[PDB]
Amino acid sequence: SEREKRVSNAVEFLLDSRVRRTPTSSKVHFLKSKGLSAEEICEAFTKVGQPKTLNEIKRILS
Ligand SMILES: COc1ccc(CN2CCc3c(c(C(=O)NCc4ccc(SC)cc4)nn3CCN)C2)c2ccccc12
C-alpha cells in the first residue's frame, strides 16, 4: 500500500546514522513535508525502536 511505502521509507530514513543524530523535531517536520501524517510518523519512530508519544509528534507539528 502507499501508507506502507510511506512508513517503510520513513523507517529506513530514521535508521541512517546521519539522521539518528539529527534532532527529533527536524525529522518530524521533514517527514510531514514528505507527506506522512502524525500517526504514520509515530509508527515509523516506534518501528525503528526510537518510540515517541503521538502527543510529542503532534506538539512538534503544532
Ligand atoms: C531532517 O533531516 C534530514 C532530512 C533529509 C535528509 C536528506 N536525505 C537524503 C538521502 C535520503 C533521504 C531520504 C528520505 O527522505 N527518506 C524518507 C522518505 C519518506 C517518505 C517517502 S514517500 C513514500 C519517501 C522518503 N531517503 N534518502 C535516500 C536513502 N534512504 C533524505 C537528511 C540527511 C541527513 C541527515 C538529516 C536529513
Ligand code: NA
Ligand atoms: Na528535537
